[PDB]
Amino acid sequence: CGYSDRVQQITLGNSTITTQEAANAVVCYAEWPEYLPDVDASDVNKTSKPDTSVCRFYTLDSKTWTTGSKGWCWKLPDALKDMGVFGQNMFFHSLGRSGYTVHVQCNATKFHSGCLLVVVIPEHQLASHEGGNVSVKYTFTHPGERGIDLSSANEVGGPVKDVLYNMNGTLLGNLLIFPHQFINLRTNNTATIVIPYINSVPIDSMTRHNNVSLMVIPIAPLTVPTGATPSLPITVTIAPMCTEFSGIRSKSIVPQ
Amino acid sequence: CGYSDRVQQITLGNSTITTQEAANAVVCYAEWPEYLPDVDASDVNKTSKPDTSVCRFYTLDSKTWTTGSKGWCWKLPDALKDMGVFGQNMFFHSLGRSGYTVHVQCNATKFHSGCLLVVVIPEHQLASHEGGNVSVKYTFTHPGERGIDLSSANEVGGPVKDVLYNMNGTLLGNLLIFPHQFINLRTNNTATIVIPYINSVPIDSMTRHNNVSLMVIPIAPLTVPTGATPSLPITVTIAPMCTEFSGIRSKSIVPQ
Amino acid sequence: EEVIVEKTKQTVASISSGPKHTQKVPILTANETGATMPVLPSDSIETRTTYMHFNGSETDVECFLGRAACVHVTEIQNKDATGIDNHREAKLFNDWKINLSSLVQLRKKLELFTYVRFDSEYTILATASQPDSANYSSNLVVQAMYVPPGAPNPKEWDDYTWQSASNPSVFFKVGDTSRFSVPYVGLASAYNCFYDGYSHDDAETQYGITVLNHMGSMAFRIVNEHDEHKTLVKIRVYHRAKHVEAWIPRAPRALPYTSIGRTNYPKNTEPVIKKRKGDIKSY
Amino acid sequence: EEVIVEKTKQTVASISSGPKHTQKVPILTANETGATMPVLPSDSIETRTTYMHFNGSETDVECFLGRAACV
Amino acid sequence: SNQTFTYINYYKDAASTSSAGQSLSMDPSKFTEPVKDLMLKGAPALN
Amino acid sequence: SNQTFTYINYYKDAASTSSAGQSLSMDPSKFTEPVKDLMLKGAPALN
Amino acid sequence: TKDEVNSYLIPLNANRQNEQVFGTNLFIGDGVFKTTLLGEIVQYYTHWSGSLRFSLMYTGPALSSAKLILAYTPPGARGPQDRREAMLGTHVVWDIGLQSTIVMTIPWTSGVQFRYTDPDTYTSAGFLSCWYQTSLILPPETTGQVYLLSFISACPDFKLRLMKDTQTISQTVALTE
RNA sequence: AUUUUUUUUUUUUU
RNA sequence: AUUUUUUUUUUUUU
């Protein structure tokens, strides 16, 4: 033996991520992602498994962690909708199912302090910022790889952006019932969460429905040492896993 | 038994072509297309086989057959470069290999006369119309699904368009050494040619190299009955077969 | 604990434990791993052998979601319909789209999970009242007709749709109850308490509300004709879940609901965490 | 379909089917014969093994005509 | 330790019956320990 | 997979009983293929 | 403007290229399917599931010829507006000859296991259309339009549950003998 | 083109 | 996450 729980390697396709100050990997509800079995299947079409071209790590854009920063939310598969062959099969097909490996980067020094809550939420239905029976419009729940900055302003047709109330009326402290992992700068620099396909249908449309949402939330505020720049980068890298596509057609057009 | 050589069905993916006045199918050099075996392989990357989404019939645009019409040429995989998931994997990958089933439609009546030569040519290198050491530019050997109308005019940087000399200096009568099939209006209305992957490399770039070219050539001129419209439509439907893609990257840009 | 089950008295609660001077520390943990270590009291103090005389049976989700709760209160009356244009607005009949998210008390118990699948048990109670002057109490019969989606909707109380050759209906007396069972009628394998999606890719379609948690609709009327007086019949529908399966435990909601199927909460709402009457070090 | 009934999971809905290049065409028919050919989706597209978890019991004419109606 | 006798179903449908009873399955580990590497108690969590 | 216990008929007449149940006979062929010569699928329908 | 025998005949024009023969949505409890024996029993039930069986019979002269392409668009995309759009879906190319019928099943392409028989946007079924693959060629000394005859039936894959009352009939007063 | 999926046992890194 | 490919024999349409 002599190995570490800290030093991990995830290889998927032609992409490889190494980490040396990891904590563990979280496997959501103790379940690895799989392909759709015949006993659960309903759609008669033979599914497409493009595995090497689509089950690979895609790196999202980086987010600046400041002291006054609130948090960021990403929707899946919406974040990976312009990313290579996966996003192309996402629009050319009417159906599709996918699991994910999410790896969130944030490295610092031993003088730094701060803690992030990386959490995956199944069916994270957002609340409108106006209340009542107001709905959230399509483009505000489908931002792409840019995600939702929760420290931004209220905008018409969009969701509420209070990080405390989790954008759905539940408090932030009870968000640990969902599959979660911390990034503590004294301990951790990465978080790995492996998501299976969680739905009440065997296979679903990947453009009108987001199965899970990924929230990176600073619980403890960022404290840089004296004279350091008051900023750290956060990077999100998501890889599809066991991805099937069914019902190929002529690329449906989504709003914007 | 009691079946026919005339009544055929080809099913590939979610696409099905029926014919009732076929002649046969031509299998090029008596060889069905296959995937790349391990003994012939050189590239170490795991290949991508998207089979259901990409190995399906794509219908090209229709061509008008007139008495003065000379013929049409199509390059593969160039003709299927904007066609769905196949054309997307063709640009997102650096390598790729594919076999094809080509089905050419031309139906008429029993009063009609005329004969087409449908021929698949491996490595159909075109001649420049100026002679000497003049080369053919990239866009004129990559027209897409529109193909090359051989009855069009000479244009600078393009190929010669004499249907007799086969655009390479060999006469049209000896073009039957290549895998060919006729469409005779008294006998035939479709032609089926199944192409394997013919190359001197195990796998090649699909954007800088066309492996085969498909020529539909009227040998006997079209004779409509008296008062009929002097025109028939010709339709080409090509399906990739046993398609692999290797070396995925960020979608190379081709000229135009 | 629930590790070891004995023969003389089963399922010990705490094992007997003594002093520790050891290099293995069960109480030092990393919650940056996203895990809860199963630390017992015997890992910190010295304990004695105690038993659980408890099974954990009332906290079963079959028991937790399986008692009758009031999901709808609607009202109809039995008055003269001659001269009335809209029978629905006059409440000669009234229909209800079946949902379990209008009483917030059942809704919070349901929305502890993402997906629930159960057979439904409905109990409908009808009570009358005559607020105006009347000589007697009418002996009234209520029809509750279960109207599936796509079925013709009633326009009047005496309309042709009430005959119900295919739609299931129940006829019961006011003051009494009608109890019937309805199976799991979701299109998918479970209902959706939450839906992060839309019906289709449209810029103006509705968020969250879906036919995945669609349970039908039932329409109410009084079969009797009109008397000299006006009598108001209040109808309360009670739902009991059974054969319950539930998935994906969620964070409990503390802010109040505002709508059906939406997760929206009111603007300028009060704080739900109780502020300390003192400082942090105060008991 | 209702042709074959399995043991591990009964009454398959669609059988697994692959590409066809054949001289027998199940989708070409004459309805001048007055008959409906039992053409399955596996005769036209490529299918996967799915099961009917369904018996066809509410469409029985005992059930169809057997509820109380106001005459 | 008596046993109840009300096991006779009167109707033909399975939706018509009474409640299913306690599962006695009781697995908290898929929420409390959803980790890839098994983590013993007493051992250091990391390295 | 329980079995219902309501198989005791209380009256003397067969018209007094409850519904008969599903036939499980299921022959569409006398409407879908009411033809004299058997017609295979895949074969040409005529000649 | 009034119901006709001609309502059952899909017109088919000669010497046309790349055009469209017909097109409809696949709400089988409404539209063209509503008065059909399939779609009159479908409206006795709330939910449907399974594969449809769509047929077309050509009734032109025996010396005529055509090639048509019958395509099914699975839900999520719009109704196809040219032949190349419908070419990317579930399609068959129909060669018209001695056998006068094509049978193109609409296979069950759905994420959810059951669709509402009443038209619903979430449980929509898709679109169906036909196009000229090559043309229609009429023999000499024959002019005019030839026709198609469209049929629908259910596969043995078909399911139908939750009986309801249909919207195809009504009355305002009771009938007398 | 008599191919497709269901899943067994062996080999390469445990 | 001890998975990936090489290929055997059986089943569904020959």
Curated annotation (Swiss-Prot), chains E, F:
> Where found, per UniProt?
Virion
Query: How is the polypeptide modified once translated?
Result: Myristoylation is required during RNA encapsidation and formation of the mature virus particle.
Q: How does it assemble?
A: Interacts with capsid protein VP1 and capsid protein VP3.
Role noted for this protein: Lies on the inner surface of the capsid shell. After binding to the host receptor, the capsid undergoes conformational changes. Capsid protein VP4 is released, Capsid protein VP1 N-terminus is externalized, and together, they shape a pore in the host membrane through which the viral genome is translocated into the host cell cytoplasm.
- The name of this protein is Capsid protein VP4
**Species of origin:** Human rhinovirus 14
- Phylogenetic lineage: Viruses, Riboviria, Orthornavirae, Pisuviricota, Pisoniviricetes
Q: Which residues of the full protein are shown?
A: 23 to 69 of 2179
